[PDB]
Write a protein that binds this ligand. Structure first.
Ligand SMILES: *[C@@H]1O[C@H](CO)[C@@H](O[C@@H]2O[C@H](CO)[C@@H](O[C@@H]3O[C@H](CO)[C@@H](O)[C@H](O)[C@H]3NC(C)=O)[C@H](O)[C@H]2NC(C)=O)[C@H](O)[C@H]1NC(C)=O
Ligand SMILES: *[C@@H]1O[C@H](CO)[C@@H](O[C@@H]2O[C@H](CO)[C@@H](O[C@@H]3O[C@H](CO)[C@@H](O)[C@H](O)[C@H]3NC(C)=O)[C@H](O)[C@H]2NC(C)=O)[C@H](O)[C@H]1NC(C)=O
Ligand SMILES: *[C@@H]1O[C@H](CO)[C@@H](O[C@@H]2O[C@H](CO)[C@@H](O[C@@H]3O[C@H](CO)[C@@H](O)[C@H](O)[C@H]3NC(C)=O)[C@H](O)[C@H]2NC(C)=O)[C@H](O)[C@H]1NC(C)=O
Ligand SMILES: *[C@@H]1O[C@H](CO)[C@@H](O[C@@H]2O[C@H](CO)[C@@H](O)[C@H](O)[C@H]2NC(C)=O)[C@H](O)[C@H]1NC(C)=O
Ligand SMILES: *[C@@H]1O[C@H](CO)[C@@H](O[C@@H]2O[C@H](CO)[C@@H](O)[C@H](O)[C@H]2NC(C)=O)[C@H](O)[C@H]1NC(C)=O
Ligand SMILES: *[C@@H]1O[C@H](CO)[C@@H](O[C@@H]2O[C@H](CO)[C@@H](O)[C@H](O)[C@H]2NC(C)=O)[C@H](O)[C@H]1NC(C)=O
Ligand SMILES: *[C@@H]1O[C@H](CO)[C@@H](O[C@@H]2O[C@H](CO)[C@@H](O)[C@H](O)[C@H]2NC(C)=O)[C@H](O)[C@H]1NC(C)=O
Ligand SMILES: *[C@@H]1O[C@H](CO)[C@@H](O[C@@H]2O[C@H](CO)[C@@H](O)[C@H](O)[C@H]2NC(C)=O)[C@H](O)[C@H]1NC(C)=O
Ligand SMILES: *[C@@H]1O[C@H](CO)[C@@H](O[C@@H]2O[C@H](CO)[C@@H](O)[C@H](O)[C@H]2NC(C)=O)[C@H](O)[C@H]1NC(C)=O
Ligand SMILES: *[C@@H]1O[C@H](CO)[C@@H](O)[C@H](O)[C@H]1NC(C)=O
Ligand SMILES: *[C@@H]1O[C@H](CO)[C@@H](O)[C@H](O)[C@H]1NC(C)=O
Ligand code: MET
Ligand SMILES: [Zn+2]
Length: 902
């Protein structure tokens, strides 16, 4: 019998009712330089089963309670046993209260404690964030409990199902503002022991999980709106950010988004107010704390003067995502972290729906396809992938919990949930989702509870018919890893599925309960006309006249890539699709125009089509005006450029791309009125951005001229930047490429005085585009100077120089030479030797370069490789793969590009 305090999961003998928590951050160091916070707490809990021990979470807290580490009382007229001893068990992060007798079922107890911890700059629990305002370093106090850090701020039953109400009080300097999940009860009052401090009490939370608590003390200010139902909406930020109007876009979209979700979920927004706060350098990105959502600044703030359209898109979708959680995740909470994918996957899907409500002309819903579907398919098409579901009993430690937060959970979660909504229809999906939210409000669930409520909605209607239960179908997509390639022989209409792997030689060793067979929803379009929907059952092989064609017809599966799979055809059908795209592309949905490209390049990698068939699939692009198909091409070819841009292959590649992109460049030249005015909607702005990037990086004289003109123009008038933020990264880069030290030094000056991170990023990246060796080397010289280049930016900048074909050997030489600075910077802030290794070795594709990476490894005899130790072996393995891919492909690809570049 193991001792319960040596077990990672809490006992179920005691359940919390409600907490009082009072926290007091000290934002002035104790002069040996330590920042602390002090706290006091009381937890009221109910005994379910008799027990003589109280086990509660505590992490990095010192206790100053009078007597033992806690004081224990009976609620009402309950007696309480005497404490034997209290002890802290660090490994399982427990405070353990051993009693002289047993607690009694049905009785309630209150346990009071007094404690303090470091207010560290560690982004965990109650922690400090330092930032600059003019001359002054400012320090604020803020929280990040996700996942298992509530216990780092106060002792609590820190598991998501053990929900309770919380009464938060902040004691804080009297000129600072205090925020928490709920509104303040009233005005703050002076702390009697020292009136320089004030006390702010907050209203009682609803029943809620510990990981969703938040409290913040700062000088921040807000912009505000009162929705029509009296819900107060505020955006909080640095006083200077607020004064500059950088909060306005967020404020603009928040109201519409909250409105959309209340209707979408058929459930009122469950709180009296919504705060969102922009934090400088919040590395976690965003966190959905209930009623007080935190964001990194660049994710919430928007500067119309200097921010691009893609930045606007990031803001509205990140907001939609976090607000989605205010019902799904926060109101109804997954019982355990093994089900995280459902929570994060769900938000990662509906973020597009919410944002689409706020920006209905942008067609944002499409973006899930490039953004999540094809993104996650890259890693789910590997033998080393994993199922969405993990047994709850395998997820115990805080480290194991953290491993839940990955690509598969978010992006495959989103993909499979989107599929599910689509095959149910959205109306049906919403009905089940509403049923689920109403049944489990303020409680906890597993994914089986959602399936059950969706099944109830299916069962209550007659129009949508499924080949099996919702659970049986979703089991195929959740219990085994990966996804199928669906192959169609249009001569017969034979249709097959197999587990798709990019590496046709991989051994899959993870076994599946289903032998890697799925139940697949298959929409299809024939000669531009929608066909009846089809379900592939759990069989290798089937046949249907839906997928049989005559010789002048074509068929195309998976309309809008709603299904989580990729599609291959016989060659003849590929040809027919190609001809259609050549003659009238409008007959095929824009998403599927992209799909044909995405899938075929993946199929070529897996050796299922020839690489030339994939390249053929790009031939239609000379007439393509729209964003997505062009993005599919650019994403799929970035590897070809990586492999070939130092080779004889490159000339014909450039020439071909110039040929393809010229007419699009010409299109936007007219449409934008000589580049004076951007296209109106997002997709077309993105397309223009890509067309100009593509034109310029491939050496179209017209684009090269445009870039030189604008940058000359900016240089003759530094205070009035003539270059629209959408075009900045291309135009800067190309203009510095064409120019010398005049252009470089000017842009350097501009970088040194950029007030805005996003504009600093663009400049830093453009500076690496110089074609002078001596400039690139001098630039490399700067990257380790913290006065000239921020440390957190050092490896990014080296990677950018490596990205330059001329900068490749310079960066590689530089990394090798100054490698003995692991011992100045695996202690001087993380650094990320891992990202730096991947970046500088990314190009390697020959035996000779492999011999060099091997030779560089042979400084194993000390200093090692830090957090990049495994990245190095990944580089040696990827170089092997590249050598093999280049030998197989060089000849065929050269001749294709030669053939097709006119
Ligand atoms: C968790 O915190 C709650 C808020 O502080 C505590 O509830 C409050 O207790 C206060 C004092 O115990 C009460 O305020 C006043 O106290 C004086 C004592 O001098 C009394 O006469 C009055 O009852 C009261 N005055 C007024 C105007 O109500 C509050 O009644 C009370 N606040 C509430 C209930 O909202 C909880 O007791 C504390 N929990 C535990 C377990 O200690
Ligand atoms: C929680 O309690 C911990 C244990 O009491 C504290 O950790 C101790 O921090 C002390 C001061 O930061 C260190 O003691 C000494 O500090 C003086 C100056 O303050 C130095 O001259 C000494 O070098 C140093 N003593 C030694 C032996 O090096 C201790 O290093 C440290 N003790 C332990 C056991 O880790 C925490 O500070 C306390 N945390 C909070 C937030 O209250
Ligand atoms: C938050 O929403 C606000 C209300 O919709 C937006 O306010 C709009 O800002 C636009 C951009 O400045 C203005 O549009 C144009 O502004 C120029 C400025 O000189 C004028 O030429 C145009 O006539 C004008 N166009 C229109 C259609 O009016 C709008 O004046 C203004 N609209 C309102 C109602 O005030 C904010 O832009 C938005 N904030 C962000 C960051 O997106
Ligand atoms: C947190 O504050 C709330 C609201 O004041 C307290 O809820 C009260 O609980 C008492 C004691 O159980 C009840 O008699 C009252 O009916 C409750 N009031 C309301 C409005 O629900 C709650 O007890 C507090 N939590 C703690 C740990 O003290
Ligand atoms: C809140 O009060 C504190 C203390 O009066 C102010 O902090 C001082 O600000 C000056 C610059 O104006 C600094 O030189 C001092 O070093 C600060 N002292 C400390 C201990 O930080 C603060 O500016 C006030 N804030 C607001 C929003 O009014
Ligand atoms: C949740 O959805 C239900 C069902 O659509 C809403 O109730 C309906 O509201 C419509 C719109 O006026 C009425 O015409 C229907 O007769 C109502 N149906 C039923 C069964 O009452 C309800 O308003 C929604 N609730 C929330 C909080 O959004
Ligand atoms: C986790 O959620 C479940 C519901 O999924 C909670 O169990 C319910 O408890 C409520 C209130 O006591 C009852 O109305 C229901 O009968 C219960 N449903 C069940 C048992 O299926 C459960 O309390 C939550 N767990 C914790 C620790 O709060
Ligand atoms: C389409 O599938 C059918 C299988 O149902 C294939 O035809 C069968 O092939 C086997 C091969 O030995 C014959 O023994 C069976 O008699 C065939 N069944 C028939 C004719 O009904 C057919 O080859 C497949 N066509 C493809 C993959 O293009
Ligand atoms: C495939 O996706 C396209 C969008 O890329 C869908 O077209 C949209 O359809 C909705 C409703 O018909 C309209 O409100 C949008 O304005 C349409 N946008 C465009 C650009 O056409 C299309 O409906 C989807 N096809 C299928 C079969 O689901
Ligand atoms: C997988 O096992 C087969 C056994 O036939 C072997 O040929 C192959 O090299 C192994 N591994 C990979 C990654 O191909
Ligand atoms: C191409 O197809 C579209 C949509 O099917 C149709 O509206 C149009 O008539 C065709 N365009 C041309 C120029 O023939
Ligand atoms: C992984 S920490 C970030 C917090 C939050 N759950 C998110 O998905 O952004
Ligand atoms: Zn999320």
């Amino acid at each position: 019998q193991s001792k319960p305090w040596n077990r990672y999961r809490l006992p179920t003998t005691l359940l919390p009712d409600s907490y009082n928590v009072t926290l007091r951050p000290y934002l002035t160091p104790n002069a040996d330089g330590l920042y602390i916070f002090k706290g006091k707490s009381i937890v009221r809990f109910l005994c379910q089963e008799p027990t003589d021990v109280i086990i509660i979470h505590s992490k990095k807290l010192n206790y100053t309670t009078q007597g033992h580490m806690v004081v224990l009382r009976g609620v009402g007229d309950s007696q309480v046993p005497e404490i034997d001893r209290t002890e802290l068990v660090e490994l399982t992060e427990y405070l353990v209260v051993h009693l002289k007798g047993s607690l009694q079922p049905g009785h309630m107890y209150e346990m009071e404690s007094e404690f303090q911890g470091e207010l560290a700059d560690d982004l965990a629990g109650f922690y400090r964030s330092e930032y600059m305002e003019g001359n002054v370093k400012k320090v604020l106090a803020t929280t990040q409990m996700q996942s298992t850090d509530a216990r780092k701020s106060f002792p609590c039953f820190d598991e998501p199902a053990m929900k309770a109400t919380f009464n938060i009080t902040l004691i804080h300097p009297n000129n600072l503002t205090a925020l928490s999940n709920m509104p303040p009860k009233g005005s703050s009052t002076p702390l009697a022991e020292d009136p320089n401090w004030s006390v702010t009490e907050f209203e009682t939370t609803p029943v809620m999980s510990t990981y969703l608590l938040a409290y913040i003390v700062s000088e921040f200010q807000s912009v505000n709106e009162t929705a029509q139902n009296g819900v107060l909406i505020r955006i909080w930020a640095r006083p200077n950010a607020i004064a500059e109007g950088h909060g306005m876009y967020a404020l603009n979209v928040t109201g519409p988004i909250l409105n959309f979700f209340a209707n979408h979920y058929n459930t009122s927004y469950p709180l009296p107010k919504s705060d969102q706060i922009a934090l400088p350098d919040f590395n976690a990105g965003a966190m959905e704390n209930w009623g007080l959502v935190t964001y990194r600044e660049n994710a919430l703030l928007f500067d119309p003067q200097s921010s691009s359209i893609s930045n606007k898109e990031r803001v509205v979708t990140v907001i939609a995502h976090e607000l989605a959680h205010q019902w799904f995740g926060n109101l109804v909470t997954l019982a355990w972290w093994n089900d995280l994918w459902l929570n994060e996957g769900f938000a990662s899907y509906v973020e597009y729906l919410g944002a689409d409500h706020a920006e209905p002309t942008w067609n944002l819903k499409d973006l899930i396809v490039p953004g999540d579907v094809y993104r996650v398919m890259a890693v789910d098409a590997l033998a080393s992938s994993h199922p969405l579901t993990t047994p709850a009993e395998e997820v115990n430690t805080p480290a194991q919990i953290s491993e839940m937060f990955d690509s598969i959970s978010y992006s495959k979660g989103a993909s499979v949930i989107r599929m599910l909504s689509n095959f149910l229809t959205e109306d049906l999906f919403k009905e089940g989702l509403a049923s689920y939210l109403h049944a489990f409000a303020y409680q906890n669930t597993t994914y089986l509870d959602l399936w059950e409520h969706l099944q109830k909605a299916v069962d209550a209607q007659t129009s949508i018919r499924l080949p099996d239960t919702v659970r049986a179908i979703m089991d195929r997509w959740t219990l085994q890893m990966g996804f199928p390639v669906i192959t169609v022989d249009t001569k017969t209409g034979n249709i097959s599925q197999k587990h798709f792997l990019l590496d046709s030689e991989s051994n899959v060793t993870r076994s599946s309960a289903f032998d890697y067979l799925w139940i697949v929803p298959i929409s299809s379009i024939k000669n531009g006309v929608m066909q009846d929907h089809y379900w592939l059952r759990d069989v290798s092989q089937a046949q249907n006249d839906l997928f049989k064609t005559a010789s002048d017809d074509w068929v195309l599966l998976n309309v809008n890539v709603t299904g989580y799979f990729q599609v291959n055809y016989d060659e003849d059908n590929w040809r027919m699709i190609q001809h259609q795209l050549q003659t009238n592309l409008s007959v095929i949905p824009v998403i599927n125009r992209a799909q044909v490209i995405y899938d075929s390049f993946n199929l070529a990698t897996a050796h299922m089509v020839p690489v030339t068939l994939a390249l053929d699939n790009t031939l239609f692009l000379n007439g393509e005006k729209e964003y997505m198909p062009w993005q599919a091409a650019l994403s799929s070819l970035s590897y070809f450029s990586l492999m070939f841009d130092r080779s004889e292959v490159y000339g014909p590649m450039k020439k071909y791309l110039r040929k393809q992109v010229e007419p699009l460049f010409q299109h936007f030249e007219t449409l934008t009125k000589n580049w004076t005015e951007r296209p109106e909607n997002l997709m077309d702005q993105y397309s223009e951005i890509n067309a100009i990037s593509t034109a310029c990086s491939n050496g179209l004289p017209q684009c090269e001229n445009l870039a030189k003109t604008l940058f000359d123009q900016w240089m003759s008038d530094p205070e009035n930047n003539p270059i629209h933020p959408n075009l900045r990264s291309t135009i800067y880069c190309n203009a510095i490429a064409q120019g010398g030290q005049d252009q470089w030094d000017f842009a350097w000056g501009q970088l040194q005085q950029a007030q805005l991170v996003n504009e600093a990023d663009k400049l830093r990246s453009a500076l690496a585009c110089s074609n002078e060796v001596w400039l690139l080397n001098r630039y490399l010289g700067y990257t380790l100077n913290p006065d000239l280049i921020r440390k957190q930016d050092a490896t990014s900048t080296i990677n950018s120089i490596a990205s330059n074909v001329i900068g490749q050997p310079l960066a590689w030489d530089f990394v090798q030479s100054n490698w003995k600075k692991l011992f100045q910077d695996y202690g001087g802030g993380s650094f990320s030797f891992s990202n730096l290794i991947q970046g500088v070795t990314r190009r390697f594709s020959s035996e000779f370069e492999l011999q060099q990476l091997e030779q560089f490894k042979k400084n194993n005899m000390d200093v090692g490789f830090g957090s990049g130790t495994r990245a190095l072996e990944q580089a040696l393995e990827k170089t092997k793969a590249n050598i093999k891919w280049v030998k197989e492909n060089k000849e065929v690809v050269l001749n294709w590009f030669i053939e097709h570049s006119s």
